[PDB]
């Protein structure tokens, strides 16, 4: 399964210019495009090699889409401040996430189009791609306006048609990037806390895609409530890293095993100090 997702952020700054609009687009865990309204000459910019080869018409049209969206988000922020009766002095954020998930059969599995205001759910297109779920009274104003405008029909046309076609095109043109899996390189490190205790840290490095499971077990029983687990983080080269750690009695290190699951592994790994 694969996905294409767009992430829009608009932030007002009263007294310091018009709102800034940022857009990024991803296929699965790989970014391919960026736009920033505050750049000197704002243009859609490639972030992956499999879109750098698109012609000038593609890039002009994408740029024009983002410029229009930035202008639309300025009016949305003004409308929202009014709906909520917020003071004109405060900074506010509007976020949008939309895109399409393809199933294993390469067909549309789910389309989505949802919005948050000041980091909180505001309105979302339902899975049927015909109706809306509004999170509060202010969002019911937007819901009525979009129902009147038949907004869902326009978004449904994109999510069911255009979005899927773009995703399939990118998956093919970027297949060497997007349709690989890099398995994690794994190892355990050992750090004495005292003469009596040590932490064992199980590392997974260099893997793609980002989804992964790391678990510590002890004589066969899993240690969920005593495992320190950091959020999966980017290496910066397109791949990801993660570690999981436990604190263990000195002399009992050998009783613990770390277990790694990733789609790129030929079989699950078990590591023992």
């Amino acid at each position: 399964s694969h996905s294409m997702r767009y992430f829009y952020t608009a932030v007002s700054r009263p007294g310091r210019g018009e709102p800034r609009f940022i857009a990024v687009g991803y296929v699965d865990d790989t970014q391919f495009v960026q736009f920033d309204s505050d750049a000197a000459s704002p243009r859609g910019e490639p972030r992956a090699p499999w879109v750098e080869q698109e012609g000038p018409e593609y890039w002009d049209r994408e740029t024009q889409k983002y410029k229009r969206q930035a202008q639309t988000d300025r009016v949305s922020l003004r409308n929202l401040r009014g709906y909520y009766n917020q003071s004109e002095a405060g900074s506010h954020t509007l976020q949008r996430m939309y895109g399409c998930d393809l199933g294993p059969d390469g067909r549309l599995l789910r389309g989505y189009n949802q919005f948050a205001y000041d980091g909180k759910d505001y309105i979302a297109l339902n899975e049927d791609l015909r109706s809306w779920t509004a999170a509060d009274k202010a969002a019911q104003i937007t819901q009525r306006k979009w129902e009147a405008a038949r907004e869902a029909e326009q978004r449904r046309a994109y999510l069911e048609g255009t979005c899927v076609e773009w995703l399939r095109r990118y998956l093919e043109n970027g297949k060497k990037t997007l349709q690989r899996a890099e398995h994690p390189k794994t190892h355990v490190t050992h750090h004495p806390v005292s003469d009596h205790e040590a932490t064992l840290r199980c590392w997974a490095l260099g893997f793609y895609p980002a989804e992964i499971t790391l678990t510590w077990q002890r004589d066969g029983e899993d240690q969920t409530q005593d495992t320190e687990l950091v959020e999966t983080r980017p290496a910066g080269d397109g791949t990801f890293q993660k570690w999981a750690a436990v604190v263990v009695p000195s002399g009992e290190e050998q009783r613990y095993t770390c277990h790694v699951q990733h789609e790129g592994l030929p079989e699950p790994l078990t590591l023992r100090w």
């Binding site: 049209r61 969206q69 309105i123 306006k145």
Partner: peptide, 10 residues
């Protein structure tokens, strides 16, 4: 390719 038709003003 981004979703560009229409004007989705809240």
């Amino acid at each position: 390719g981004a979703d560009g038709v229409g004007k989705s003003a809240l």
